[PDB]
């Protein structure tokens, strides 16, 4: 396997870890759900729903690398699972895999029977995607996933204003969708509008209190605005909820900038408790 399964996974022993993973997702316990889904992928690697759920969870748990590995299994097993193509496009965009991101969006659109009929990293592939999505928008004008998909595409080319407009329309249409609010927030954040981003993230966290990616993104935006007390608080939540070293290193920089050398030294132990108390 290309997937680095956690050793000593207690769900390996369980009757029905798939059910348990789904229930963990409903509860929003992402780390636990991922482990449960991992157990299913180990025991039954042909189970496409298992890889998809794993991939989906890992990306929300701020692990795009692990997400991609899992989603590619899902994509092999069911090339018409559009949730898999959608998530691959998102994680590849985050990872700046331009070609792979455009391949996923295109597959996302064309895998739907409904739809089946400059940018330096991948110029023509980009134009094609843009054209296909706009043509689809002509066939189905108020489709929130089409607007969201144009948001992903426009993030890829750093056209954060067009991305934000499309994604704002998507959340107007689906205001209880946690992923859409996070996507809008990330867009706004990357487009140097972190205050607005934080409002979107707050909506996302209210829907899914276990959305570790949103928590991380909030640490990022607060750090960008140099509100380090607020960044530190969100980052502690993120680290605690995630379970990593990259986040601890980011946390270390916050503690340094705020002139807390006593706390910086404590980050190597990687115990979140003194920091949970502190913040």
């Amino acid at each position: 396997t290309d997937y680095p399964f956690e050793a000593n996974n207690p769900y390996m022993y369980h009757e029905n870890p798939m059910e348990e993973g789904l229930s963990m997702l409903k509860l929003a316990n992402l780390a636990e759900a991922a482990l449960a889904f991992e157990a299913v992928c180990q025991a039954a690697p042909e189970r496409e729903e298992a890889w998809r759920s794993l991939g989906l969870t890992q990306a929300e748990n701020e692990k795009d690398g692990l997400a991609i590995i899992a989603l590619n299994h899902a994509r092999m097993l069911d090339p018409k699972d559009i949730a898999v193509h959608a998530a691959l496009a998102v994680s590849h965009t985050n990872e700046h895999n331009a070609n792979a991101a455009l391949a996923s969006l295109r597959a996302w659109l064309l895998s739907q029977p409904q739809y089946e009929q400059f940018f330096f990293a991948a110029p023509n592939e980009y134009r094609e995607c843009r054209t296909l999505l706009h043509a689809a928008l002509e066939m189905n004008p108020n489709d929130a996933q089409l607007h969201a998909s144009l948001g992903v595409l426009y993030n890829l080319s750093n056209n954060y204003d067009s991305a934000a407009a499309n994604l704002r329309r998507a959340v107007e249409l689906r205001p209880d969708d946690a992923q859409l609010w996070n996507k809008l927030g990330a867009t706004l954040a990357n487009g140097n509008r972190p205050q607005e981003a934080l409002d979107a993230y707050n909506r996302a966290l209210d829907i899914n209190p276990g959305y570790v990616r949103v928590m991380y993104n909030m640490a990022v935006s607060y750090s960008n605005m140099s509100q380090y007390d607020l960044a530190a608080k969100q980052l502690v939540r993120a680290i605690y909820m995630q379970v990593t070293r990259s986040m601890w290193d980011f946390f270390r920089m916050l503690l340094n900038v705020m002139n807390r050398p006593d706390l910086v030294e404590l980050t190597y132990a990687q115990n979140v408790e003194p920091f949970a108390k502190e913040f």
């Binding site: 701020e62 993030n155 990330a186 954040a189 990616r213 990022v220």
Partner: peptide
């Protein structure tokens, strides 16, 4: 400065 994630 820091990148945000979709």
């Amino acid at each position: 400065n820091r990148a945000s994630k979709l």
